Curated annotation (Swiss-Prot), chains B, C:
GO terms for molecular function: citrate (Si)-synthase activity; identical protein binding; NADH binding. It catalyses: oxaloacetate + acetyl-CoA + H2O = citrate + CoA + H(+). Changing E207A: Weakened NADH binding and inhibition. Coiled coil: none annotated. Its EC number is 2.3.3.16. Belongs to the citrate synthase family. This is Citrate synthase. It is an enzyme of class 2 (transferase). Pfam families: Citrate_synt. The lineage of its organism: Bacteria, Pseudomonadati, Pseudomonadota, Gammaproteobacteria, Enterobacterales.
Amino acid sequence: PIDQLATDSNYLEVCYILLNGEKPTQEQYDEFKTTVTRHTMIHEQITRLFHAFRRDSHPMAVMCGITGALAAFYHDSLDVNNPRHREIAAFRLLSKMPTMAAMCYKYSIGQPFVYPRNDLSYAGNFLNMMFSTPCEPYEVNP
Amino acid sequence: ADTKAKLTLNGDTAVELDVLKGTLGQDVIDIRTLGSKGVFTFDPGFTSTASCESKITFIDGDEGILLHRGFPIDQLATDSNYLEVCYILLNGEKPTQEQYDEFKTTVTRHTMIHEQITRLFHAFRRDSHPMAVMCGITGALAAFYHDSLDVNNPRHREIAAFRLLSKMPTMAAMCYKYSIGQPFVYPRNDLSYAGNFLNMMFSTPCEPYEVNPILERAMDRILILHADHEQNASTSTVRTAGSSGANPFACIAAGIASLWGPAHGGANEAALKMLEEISSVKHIPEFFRRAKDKNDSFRLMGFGHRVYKNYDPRATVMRETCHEVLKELGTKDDLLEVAMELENIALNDPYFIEKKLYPNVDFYSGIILKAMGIPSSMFTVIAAMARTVGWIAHWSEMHSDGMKIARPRQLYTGYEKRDFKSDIKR
Amino acid sequence: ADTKAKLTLNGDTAVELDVLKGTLGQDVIDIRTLGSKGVFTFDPGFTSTASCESKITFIDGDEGILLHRGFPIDQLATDSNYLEVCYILLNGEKPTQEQYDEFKTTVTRHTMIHEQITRLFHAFRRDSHPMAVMCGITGALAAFYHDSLDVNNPRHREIAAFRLLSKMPTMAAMCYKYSIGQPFVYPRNDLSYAGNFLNMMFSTPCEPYEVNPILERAMDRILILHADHEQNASTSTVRTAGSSGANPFACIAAGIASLWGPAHGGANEAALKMLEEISSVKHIPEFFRRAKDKNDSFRLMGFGHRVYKNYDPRATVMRETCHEVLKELGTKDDLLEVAMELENIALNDPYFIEKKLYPNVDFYSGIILKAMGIPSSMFTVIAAMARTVGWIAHWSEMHSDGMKIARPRQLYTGYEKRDFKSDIKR
Ligand SMILES: NC(=O)C1=CN([C@@H]2O[C@H](COP(=O)(O)OP(=O)(O)OC[C@H]3O[C@@H](n4cnc5c(N)ncnc54)[C@H](O)[C@@H]3O)[C@@H](O)[C@H]2O)C=CC1
Ligand SMILES: NC(=O)C1=CN([C@@H]2O[C@H](COP(=O)(O)OP(=O)(O)OC[C@H]3O[C@@H](n4cnc5c(N)ncnc54)[C@H](O)[C@@H]3O)[C@@H](O)[C@H]2O)C=CC1
Ligand SMILES: NC(=O)C1=CN([C@@H]2O[C@H](COP(=O)(O)OP(=O)(O)OC[C@H]3O[C@@H](n4cnc5c(N)ncnc54)[C@H](O)[C@@H]3O)[C@@H](O)[C@H]2O)C=CC1
């Protein structure tokens, strides 16, 4: 039930459950969480795509733009039939999406982009990438 | 207090002119009606004309007085700090701790500029003089800050004030990092206004930067001492341009340009000619170059000033400050032993004694900055950078009074109505 | 020949003053040395203070008289071109065939802007205002043209003056192209000043652009009618700025910012508020919007002007030229028939006759610019572009007079000296 999940679980475990069909063991959770974390920073060339959009472009439009541009850069995980390719294509999107979302925001307001931080959680990190600046230490309210 | 009531002008009909008085300084003959009566004065330079009513700065050139809201520049530079002076100039009264907290937090909260504006620096040549880049940047702000251009909306003025006040030192330290191929530094909320400017000016991503408290206060002092200076040329340009609806970002840009006009406007080698003759006549370690240089003397070199007669009041606390800076940096300033020689020259050379080329606040500021490492190209960027609040206050006051549009008269002396007949045919 | 002799100011004794005479208009009272006695005059706005002696443009508001070097505006606006009028404003006399051709040539051969300047446009926002960006590039030019800043050098001043008469259209057109998103177009030395402009504004690689002779002529006259307009605020901003010794470019950038001061200085909804009320009360095809809009009437919409009493002497030709244009664009301008109703209202509606809201040059210049497919935003830009030759002449005439640094006085009514005691700790 969606209730229990939202109250007892956390996005990444649900991410694990949806994709795998079963709940994760601590060891499998560690493994899965470490894979999403390990690939949050996107290619710097892709980062150069944001800078080709107008500062006045609606964030969603920029998002569809960015996401529709990934295939050019991730040309080695396009074989929808290679099982290994699907695993990569899953993890990438799962890891880089909040990263591209917080960049669509920083862009539309003239604030510098924030790199992912491995020490931060999936949500706390998205919060950090969304709001923090190079000017002051950002406090992630629990 | 003899005739602080009335007087008379005699053109053809005895026109009654009311004499107006201040709380300090001289009296003024209200002639704002003469024009209508078909009577115009002729004062190119407004040397005998009072452009407005002001309550910000008061200067007594003969007696060496400089007051900001009634407070002597000395006390402010010794007791206060730039931001409090910023508060006082703009508000007219000193800040309560709570109001200070409030004001300081607002300047701090808006130091980082738009990243798109940051992309303007990258369109300038790496070889562009910093000041030129500054006027360029500041003249480009209106495009980005299009929501604070209504010079008539009170809320717009508050934003336009705070922005400039917060982002100026940020754009100044970027004009420096740029001209030397070093990465820009983001503002840091934990740092002070001066210490932060020092950090943005010098630090790199390679090592932790140490903000010397002595330099921190010194820099701060340079700022308080360059805040405002009554109705000078730049402050006049700002007001004139401003009385014509010009947005705050444009007024400050002309104020900046108006400020370094005497610099480039001298000659590619005016105060630079002899700076080239230091390789042929270097036989004498002083009278070569800038001891023999001034054939056409300059106060830009830090000597003399048209406003004060015997001395410059701002130079008093600047000289003292300059003493610690040199005594702090030690074995990197022993070569900069010419400041003394130069000071001695100004104090004793009959020509200098004669024409009163005394050292001014800039002489002592130049040394401080020179000892600090900041190049001469940056001196003026830092003068204007500090001077911004003085321009804003004067700009603000002008808009509260009545923003009387600049519409002076002229004495026409060209041809009379003549007919035009196409002399050419092309 | 009345008071052409002298006058005397009396405070408590007699002070005799001269009374210089101009070849046209009102004479003035020489008060230059008044300050060398402490006696000052009060006059915010200088509307009763002749700021300088000029010979470029003569005006008589009530008579509706406009003159440029004596030649009536209506004579130039018809039997000359922008460059020939520029030559006159800049040189005092109508050019000779050999003079005009050489002046013309140098203007066309310097129409391109350095590739690095072009790059700066790219860091501005697309949504920015062509005028806000126009200011940005203008005050940014000094960062490149460091070879012509020294204002006391006649060589520099001329080069700089030519760099601006050549580069303004190029610059302006690019503001437009970048705002809409079409590629920048290089100047064609085979086309006239105006044609070359309409090409840079409307040309696209997809096909060759062909300038309509009537439209080309129409733009040249818009330029002619905006060439100069005496001592106004935006020209007096150039003069004030230039007195300090500020470079030409930054001075020309000040005027642009001061020329559209009333446009943005209005408010996000000054003459734009009711423009939003054209969707709810559109039941009436005119009195909705800009027939009801002006609560705070605007001369920026083409109705009224402080200079003239009953009409604009520049609006004469502009109106005739307006018809020819509309009488050429036919089936695309029939909908812009509000131009005649608005004009009809301006001539008969009480509200207008009361405040003397007559259609000025900008009224008709706008109908033509709109008729030609030009966006509103690019109207003061074009006006600032045309007015630059004037600002060039004024700035130049001020650089011969004696370059008198604007150093006005002030009636100081602030606080008398008071000790400073800060009660803060931050
Ligand atoms: N489950 C798995 O084994 C997976 C393996 N991969 C592999 O890992 C590689 C990663 O590719 P992308 O991340 O898309 O590369 P990318 O070049 O497109 O984007 C980011 C680059 O930064 C590095 N990076 C990303 N986030 C980082 C972080 N948080 N800390 C440190 N470095 C970080 C990446 O290793 C990569 O070189 C793929 O080429 C694929 O071979 C990708 C997904 C899952
Ligand atoms: N007294 C007040 O309430 C003021 C309010 N403002 C408001 O604040 C907004 C700020 O605009 P700008 O700073 O000019 O925006 P901007 O986009 O032009 O430039 C900097 C951006 O970075 C952020 N920023 C700047 N310095 C920062 C710092 N030290 N720490 C964290 N973030 C920082 C700003 O919030 C802003 O979004 C304005 O749009 C205005 O509504 C501006 C001035 C005074
Ligand atoms: N009467 C004269 O001799 C004048 C000479 N100049 C000189 O122009 C030189 C650079 O002038 P700017 O155009 O402002 O240089 P710039 O630094 O702005 O560069 C523009 C470049 O494009 C060239 N250019 C511009 N329009 C051109 C055209 N229509 N055909 C061919 N080349 C064209 C220029 O010669 C120059 O190399 C300076 O050294 C200055 O002395 C400027 C005005 C008058």
